[PDB]
Amino acid sequence: YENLFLRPACPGNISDTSTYNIDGACVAQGDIGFGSAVQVVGIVDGVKVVAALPDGGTPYGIAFRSQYEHLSGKILDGEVCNVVSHGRVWTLTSLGEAPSLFSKLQFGSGGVVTGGSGSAGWTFAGGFVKHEDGYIIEVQVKQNAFIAPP
Amino acid sequence: SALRVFPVTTELSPTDKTFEYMTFDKVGTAQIIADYTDDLPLVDALGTSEFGK
Amino acid sequence: QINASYQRDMAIALPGMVADTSKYNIDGACVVNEGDVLVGAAVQVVQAQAVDGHKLVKALTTGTTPYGVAIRSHWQTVNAQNQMIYEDGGAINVMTSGRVWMLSKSTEAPTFGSAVKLDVDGQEKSDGTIETTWTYAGGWTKYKDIQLVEVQLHQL
Amino acid sequence: QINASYQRDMAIALPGMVADTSKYNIDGACVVNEGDVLVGAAVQVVQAQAVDGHKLVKALTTGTTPYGVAIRSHWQTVNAQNQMIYEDGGAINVMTSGRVWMLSKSTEAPTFGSAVKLDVDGQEKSDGTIETTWTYAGGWTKYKDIQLVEVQLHQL
């Protein structure tokens, strides 16, 4: 009774076949890069409008890699977008060394992981590899973890 | 002119005291989606009735 | 003497109707106790049987803790007061996770991602006294004289 | 002579049994060669791989964070006392979310929805020294000479 692993290990894709959720009814304002956190700025007709994470926002999900929706290499303004709201996913990071297992991550500007000492939110899942003179980490996203401030 | 300006039907047995009829309705929506999604919206239906004497 | 055409739109929500096919989880091993509940209202658990395993649920009251929201079902519900309810001594379909349309008593649109607060009778309210951990999912509509809101729930 | 008939009821559960089919999540790992782990008892992770995420786990210890509960599966053996275990070197299935039948050493039925307290060896106790996020699901039963309790595991 076990969960299979997923082989390609690139940023912006899913790392396991555990319970995951993909919110595919969204549109982008500005440009978004695969493997970055996004935030919900508004809702029109059951569609969520997302943008790259600013300072002071609450992350909602992580952009997901697809080879039909995004032929350019990144997500462009006015495009339908895939966003992962629950599951394990490879994220871009600016950190230098792996944090403690099962710690709480903190997101800098642009939707990159820079902290490992948060109070509550998403947690580190134990994966840490290297990409392009930069690193990739593995994050565990949960649905109601970050709550929008009143 | 009450029996000539309005239709007269005969589909009622002489020994009946009440009659009932049905009406129905429906709701739903559709959205623009991408290739990988799991948030397809749903639809439903309704019903109700009235009476007579 | 020219022809004409007309255009009409269906409604988009119903009380207790499941918002979409995303993550959801349904508890069907419960039984309603001491009264009846409303489709699209929060419920509370009194006790859980140790051996039998069936949970006992009732409508939310003051000072309690919510567990889930009853959902629509054309077969398990009985029709009273021109609405579907769950009469006493019968199996009930509680929802423990997912997005669902709930009856509301507020008058203004909520903020996406904020926490949900309820009334003492299991109906959402913008300034309720009962505090939960569920969130708003963004949806906000209105049927004929009925106010509905889209709420996202996680396992207790 | 008068004909007679008899009747018996089966035992409800087993140590380490998955209770129901409501959203479980089980992952495989390898057991650290230091010490064996009892099926139905909590475990801890000592270190994780950086490339993939495969984890090495062993028995629980004071002042540590539990990770999951070992469940019955194919790769399991017997101890000297005929108690079911996972060997020092081999595969272990660990559930991180869902309802499981976990070993207990308390004496009183717990209250639904409350927090769970653990012990040094990884068995539930009413006044344990280890804090957890898990909850009680209300099931309180007893296999032959062994007490079991129904625990809901929330993903860390």
Query: Cβ(A137)–Cβ(A95) under 8 Å?
Result: yes
Residue (of D47, D43, D56) closest to D85 by Cα position: D43
Decide if D23 and C156 are in contact by the 8 Å CB cutoff: no
At least 3 CB pairs under 8 A between chains B and D: no
Residue (of D130, D2, D116, D9) closest to D59 by Cα position: D130
Q: Residues followed by a break in chain B, C–N over 2.5 Å?
A: none
Query: Cβ(B41)–Cβ(B29) under 8 Å?
Result: yes
Q: How far apart are the C-alpha atoms of A110 and A104, rounded to whole Å?
A: 18
Residue (of D33, D39, D51) closest to D122 by Cα position: D39
Token pair of C117, please? 């607060």
Decide if B27 and C82 are in contact by the 8 Å CB cutoff: no
Decide if A98 and D28 are in contact by the 8 Å CB cutoff: no
Taking one residue from A and the other from D, the number of pairs with CB-CB distance under 8 angstroms is 50
Interface residues on B facing A, Cβ-Cβ cutoff 8 A = 29, 31-39, 41
Q: How far apart are the C-alpha atoms of A54 and C44, rounded to whole Å?
A: 39
Q: How far apart are the C-alpha atoms of C33 and C89, rounded to whole Å?
A: 6
Phi, psi of A110 (to 5 degrees): 85, 0
Amino acid at A39: Q
Alpha helices of D5-90 — where are they, by DSSP H?
none
Decide if C45 and D113 are in contact by the 8 Å CB cutoff: yes
Structure solved using which method? Answer: cryo-EM
Q: How far apart are the C-alpha atoms of D54 and D45, rounded to whole Å?
A: 10
Q: How far apart are the C-alpha atoms of D141 and D145, rounded to whole Å?
A: 11
* Nearest CB partner across the interface for B31, out of A47, A64, A81: A47
- Using CB atoms within 10 Å of the CB of residue D82, give its burial: 0 to 12 exposed, 13 to 18 middle, 19+ buried: exposed
Question: Which residues in A lie closer than 8 A to residue D23 (C-beta atoms)?
Answer: 19
The shortest C-alpha distance from C22 to chain A (Å) reads 7
The shortest C-alpha distance from C77 to chain D (Å) reads 23
Residue (of D67, D141, A93, A146) closest to C53 by Cα position: D141
- The number of angstroms, rounded, from the C-alpha of A58 to the middle of its chain's C-alpha atoms is 12
Taking one residue from C and the other from D, the number of pairs with CB-CB distance under 8 angstroms is 29
CB contact B40 to C (< 8 Å): yes
Decide if A127 and D93 are in contact by the 8 Å CB cutoff: no
Question: Which residues in C lie closer than 8 A to residue B27 (C-beta atoms)?
Answer: 10-14, 17
Amino acid at B1: S
Q: How far apart are the C-alpha atoms of D15 and D70, rounded to whole Å?
A: 10
Decide if D23 and A101 are in contact by the 8 Å CB cutoff: no
Q: Where are the beta strands (DSSP E) in chain D?
A: 25-31, 37-38, 42-48, 55-59, 68-70, 77-78, 84-86, 91-103, 115-118, 130-143, 146-153
Q: How far apart are the C-alpha atoms of C9 and A93, rounded to whole Å?
A: 47
The shortest C-alpha distance from B40 to chain A (Å) reads 9
Beta bridge partners of A136: A92, A129
The shortest C-alpha distance from D75 to chain A (Å) reads 11
Decide if C133 and A150 are in contact by the 8 Å CB cutoff: no
Residue (of D40, D64, D29) closest to D123 by Cα position: D40
* Nearest CB partner across the interface for C14, out of B41, B44, B48: B44
Decide if A127 and D71 are in contact by the 8 Å CB cutoff: no
Query: Cβ(B32)–Cβ(A47) under 8 Å?
Result: yes
Amino acid at C39: V
CB contact A140 to D (< 8 Å): yes
Query: Cβ(A146)–Cβ(A121) under 8 Å?
Result: yes
Residue (of A103, A29, A32, A88) closest to A63 by Cα position: A32
* Nearest CB partner across the interface for C18, out of B26, B29, B42: B42
Question: Which residues in A lie closer than 8 A to residue D73 (C-beta atoms)?
Answer: 1
Q: How far apart are the C-alpha atoms of D76 and A88, rounded to whole Å?
A: 29
Q: What dihedral do alpha carbons A9, D71, D25, C50 form, nearest 10°? A: -170
Q: What's the 3-state SS for chain B?
A: CHHHHCCCCCCCCCCCCCCEEEECCEECCCCCCCCCCCCCECCEECCEEEECC
Taking one residue from A and the other from B, the number of pairs with CB-CB distance under 8 angstroms is 43
Decide if C20 and B26 are in contact by the 8 Å CB cutoff: no
> In angstroms, what is the resolution?
3.5
Query: Cβ(C152)–Cβ(A143) under 8 Å?
Result: yes
